[PDB]
Design a protein around this ligand. Structure first.
Ligand SMILES: OC[C@H]1O[C@@H](O[C@H]2[C@H](O)[C@@H](O)[C@H](O)O[C@@H]2CO)[C@H](O)[C@@H](O)[C@H]1O
Ligand SMILES: OC[C@H]1O[C@@H](O[C@H]2[C@H](O)[C@@H](O)[C@H](O)O[C@@H]2CO)[C@H](O)[C@@H](O)[C@H]1O
Lengths: 132, 132
C-alpha cells in the first residue's frame, strides 16, 4: 500500500485520510508510526477477516511483533464507498474519529510526541491525506 | 521532505499537492516518478536560486542524472503562503496547473502511463495530497 514518510505528525496536529473501500474488500488498515516494522497505531478495518466480520481491530507493532489487540464492532464502512478518518493524539492516547460520529480511543503505548510514517494497506484506494 | 511511495497515479487521474511555502524560501520542488533517484517530472519553484529568481525550472532525472532543463517565468507563489498545484498527464505530456489556474506543459520523456512515487524537496512543507 501507500507509504508516506518523512512527515511530522506531532502533538497538537490532526491527520485526515480519505479513501474508497474496494468492491469486495476483505480488510484495509491505516497505520501511523515510524516504518512498516514500527507502528504505534494500526487500525484494521475487517470486513471479513477470519472470525472478524465488520470489526475494527487496533494494535501496535514493536520490532515487527504485534502487541495486544483492541476491538470495536462499530463499523461505519461499506465496500465500494468513500470514507474519511481523522486522528489526533496526546502522550496518553490516540483519538480516532470514524465516519457517522463513531470514535475509538487507543493507547499511545510508548508516549511518543511525533510520528514520521503513515501507511494505508489492503483493500482501499487512497483519495487524500491532510495533515496540519 | 515528504516521500510518498507506491501511490497509484495513472492516466486520467489528477494529483493535487498543497502546502505552505517557508517564510524565507529559496526554492522547493515537487517530484513525480519512481524514487528520489528516478523522476519523470521535477518542478523546481525557485524564489532565489542563483540566476533563477521567481522562475520555475522543469526537468527529469534518470539514474540520479539530470536531463535537459526547461524554464517558465509564470510564478504565482509567495514565500510564507499556501500553495497548491494539480498535475495530470497523457502518454506524451505532463500538465501542471499552477496556483493562479494557468497551466505549464512538460514532456513525458519516457512515455509512461503511470507513476508510483512523489516527493517534496526544499523550503516548503506539504499539508495535502489528493488523487481524483
Ligand atoms: O493485531 C493486528 C494484526 O492482527 C493479525 O492477525 C491476528 C488476529 O487478529 C488474531 O485474532 C490472532 O489471534 O492472531 C493473528 C496474528 O497476530 C494480522 O495478521 C495482522 O496483519 C494485523 O492486522
Ligand atoms: O535541472 C534541475 C536541477 O537543477 C540543479 O541546478 C542546476 C541549475 O539549474 C543550472 O542552471 C546550473 O547550470 O547547474 C545546476 C546544477 O546542475 C539543482 O541543483 C538540482 O537540485 C535540480 O533542481
Amino acid at each position: 500500500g501507500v507509504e508516506v514518510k518523512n512527515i511530522t505528525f506531532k502533538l497538537g496536529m490532526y491527520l485526515t485520510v480519505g479513501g474508497v473501500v474496494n468492491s469486495n474488500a476483505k480488510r484495509f488498515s491505516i497505520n501511523v508510526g515510524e516504518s512498516t516494522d514500527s507502528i504505534a497505531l494500526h487500525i484494521d478495518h475487517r470486513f471479513s477477516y477470519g472470525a472478524d466480520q465488520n470489526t475494527i481491530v487496533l494494535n501496535s507493532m514493536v520490532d515487527d511483533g504485534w502487541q495486544q489487540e483492541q476491538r470495536s464492532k462499530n463499523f461505519p464502512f461499506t465496500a465500494g464507498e468513500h470514507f474519511q478518518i481523522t486522528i489526533t493524539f496526546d502522550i496518553d492516547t490516540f483519538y480516532i474519529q470514524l465516519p457517522d460520529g463513531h470514535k475509538v480511543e487507543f493507547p499511545n503505548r510508548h508516549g511518543d510526541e511525533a510520528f514520521n510514517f503513515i501507511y494505508l494497506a489492503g483493500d482501499a484506494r487512497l483519495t487524500f491525506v491532510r495533515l496540519e
